[PDB]
Amino acid sequence: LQTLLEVKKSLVTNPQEDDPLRQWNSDNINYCSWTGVTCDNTGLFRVIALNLTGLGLTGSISPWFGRFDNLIHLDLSSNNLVGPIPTALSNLTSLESLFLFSNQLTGEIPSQLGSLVNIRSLRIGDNELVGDIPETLGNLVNLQMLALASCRLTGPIPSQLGRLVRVQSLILQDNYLEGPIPAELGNCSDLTVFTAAENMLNGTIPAELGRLENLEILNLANNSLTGEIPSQLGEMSQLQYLSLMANQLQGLIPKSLADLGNLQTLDLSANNLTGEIPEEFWNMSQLLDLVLANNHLSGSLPKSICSNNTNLEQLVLSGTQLSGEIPVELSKCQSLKQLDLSNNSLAGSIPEALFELVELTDLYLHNNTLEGTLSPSISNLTNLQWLVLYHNNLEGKLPKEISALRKLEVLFLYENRFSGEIPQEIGNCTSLKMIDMFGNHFEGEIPPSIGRLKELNLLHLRQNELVGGLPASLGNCHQLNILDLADNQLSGSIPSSFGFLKGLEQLMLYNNSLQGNLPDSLISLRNLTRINLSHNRLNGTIHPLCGSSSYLSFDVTNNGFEDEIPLELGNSQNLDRLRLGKNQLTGKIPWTLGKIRELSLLDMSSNALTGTIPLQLVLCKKLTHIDLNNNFLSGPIPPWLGKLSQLGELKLSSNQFVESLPTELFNCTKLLVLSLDGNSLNGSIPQEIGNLGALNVLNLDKNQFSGSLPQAMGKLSKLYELRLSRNSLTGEIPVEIGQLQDLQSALDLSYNNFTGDIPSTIGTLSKLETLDLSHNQLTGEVPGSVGDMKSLGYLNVSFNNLGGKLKKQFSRWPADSFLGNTGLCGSPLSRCN
């Protein structure tokens, strides 16, 4: 019977020519010799155990397996098998091991597995099984191990699972099981490891779990249990590991947990626990890991601390709202490797005793209020790899002893008040991968020793007071991703050795005094992502920076860069922000910016660019800001700018643009600043400009506009600055203008050819601070409301053709405000003869 059955499923477990089970053919007919099979040792033949794991099988499990009434160990683990678990294994009552783990199995766990009461270990996890856990599993009273982890199983933990009196390991983590944890598991009394981590248990932890005298491991992390931690769990005296992290637990931490004499790790981080840390914990000799971070605890470290914590390796109390100073008593925990007190409200100095903790690898004191100095005793922590002190108010020089730390990897001192030189021996800390000292008051040169730090991937010295050159030695730090020396006082040229930083993604050098050409070697930096060289004294061409594609932001504002803008900037499709302002660049704007789909802010102001705006930039639909001021650009304002629906600020002033304003432009309904002053635009102003309802600033000065002023300009209700001076406008000023209630900064109509009366409605301009109508041809008398203007500070109406006795509102405006008007007499001027 059974040698038919053995070759039967080799058909279903391998639907293929190639057989890892090659030995299973009727040609070698003694099946006991075959790979993976074991026959009875008693001479009656038949199969007792099958071991097929690590074979790489990709097929299915079949009901013919159930035919073996003498199978005791079935192991199909750690293959890639597919399909359901056959309920036909119902029939193999003789089975004592069932291992299906680490496959790709599907379906629910069969109800009928409950009839295998002589089973001892069941492992079917690391599969994609989908059902609720069947309550029949409680029948398997002989079971010592049950693993259902890392699948897709649902529903409550069956409470009629407490019948499994003799189970030693219960493994349910990494599923979707939900509801309360049953009190009935108190009756599983040889239980020693129990994990239901990474599930959805939503009850409170039953106190009946204190019942389990032999429990050594308890792990319910990453769940959603609520309530207070039962003090009855102090009764679990064989326990070594407790984690309840990442739940929604409430209340004060129970004081009994010190009664767990064998406890090696206690983790209750990431809950809503409160109260103080029970001082009983400081008497827990055998504890290794105490982590209580991110709980709304209260109070401060008592001087009882480390009273009897001889074995403690890791103490984590960050984000626990602790107050007070660091205890000198904490140096009694001489064994301690990792101390984390960050993200608290600690004060005072760092105690000199804490450099007695010579086994420390990690010291976290950041984001407190600590003051004082960093002691040269830091050399004693010779094993330290992460030293993290940022966002404190530490001061003074930085110890030259920091150079004894040959295993140091991370040095975070930023946002303190440190001062003086960086230690010239800093390069002795060869292991260093990240150095951040931003925001201090470090002075003097950057240590050339830093070029010893081959592992260095981050260097950040920004916002200090450092002086002198950029050290060529830094070109030896080949693994640098971010180099940021901005906001200093650095001088000299960039050294051509920086071309050796082939993996560098961010280069920030802005706000310094760097000078001279960029070295041609920077072309090798083809992984660059963000550059900012702004506000320096660099010259030569920017071509060496465009060896990289994949820029996100490229800033060189305010330098002395010369020649043409490289068309290669187009290579960075994802360039969000391009700033070349305040340089000496020449030639036309490059068409290839049209390749930059992601361009949003373009600034080329204050260069010597010539030509026109390339049509291809219509492709940059995300543009919100264009700044081309103070160039030598020519030709019309291109109507395709209206296709930039997102354009909020268009600055084209002090160029040589030369014709009429296109109607298309006013499809840019999101414009807030349109300034085109200082060009040579001609023609009239279009009615459709009122289409710009959001517009805040309109400045058309020092062009040569013509004709009358549109009635639609009263539509710009949000406009606070209006400048149209030094044009040739010809009409009378519209009564519709009084609708611009938000005008504040200026209303400048000077040096035009306006005629008629000044409209009485201008006095309606409640918030306008400056009104200039000088050098026109306006007539009549000034309406007096204009003199009373509540917010007005400057008034000039000189060089018009007005007359009469000035209404008495105009006292203490100066005579200079009414100059050149023959035939005007009044309060500030001469008497009416």
């Binding site: 491991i217 984690s243 890991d289 971070a293 984390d340 920004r462 901005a486 961010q506």
Partner: peptide
Amino acid sequence: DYGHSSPKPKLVRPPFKLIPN
């Protein structure tokens, strides 16, 4: 694949300051 059944508590690793870009 399977996860550890009682892992040793590991420290968070805190950030370097940056926001300029």
